């Protein structure tokens with residue numbers, strides 16, 4: 287929906303923690319996604335040979351993709367909602383090439399929140415959680431708009 291300026295400030299303050307260790311966050315987020323929602327792994331021809339968490343933790347290539355994911359998300363979040371320019375290519379690849387259902391963006395949003403609780407206990411309270419959830423919900427809703435514009439049902 288629309289975040290307050292206060293809420294965006296909180297979102298970006300938590301993001302600065304992500305930016306201090308991008309690869310470790312990105313690795314944790316993709317592995318959490320694959321553990322909580324294994325169906326999502328099946329969509330990655332690149333990774334689906336990885337069978338266990340331990341195997342996933344040992345893939346440098348998974349870590350690299352985690353950086354790529356978070357770099358993109360970060361650019362989006364820094365736009366504080368004014369992210370049309372960022373969402374157009376992302377929606378195009380994800381709807382038309384990777385063919386990812388929108389529901390999976392809910393799953394990755396859940397993984398992000400989980401990893402923030404795991405990595406930043408004592409520094410990720412109800413206020414920050416609420417703000418980040420709003421930002422991720424806006425992102426998902428706006429990607430779903432872009433899927434529809436491409437002619438899909440996400």
Ligand code: HEM
Nearest residue numbers: 326329330332354355358359376379380384386390391394
């Ligand atoms: C925060 C949410 C996400 C962001 C920011 C994101 C971002 C990216 C970026 C930047 C790329 C590389 C460029 C491109 O192809 O667009 C990518 C590739 C990809 N994404 Fe995502 N992604 C997200 C969620 C998801 C989810 C939830 C899935 C599947 C369940 C998914 C599946 C893929 C696949 C399959 C590729 C190609 C990977 C490869 O073979 O190299 N993405 N994503």
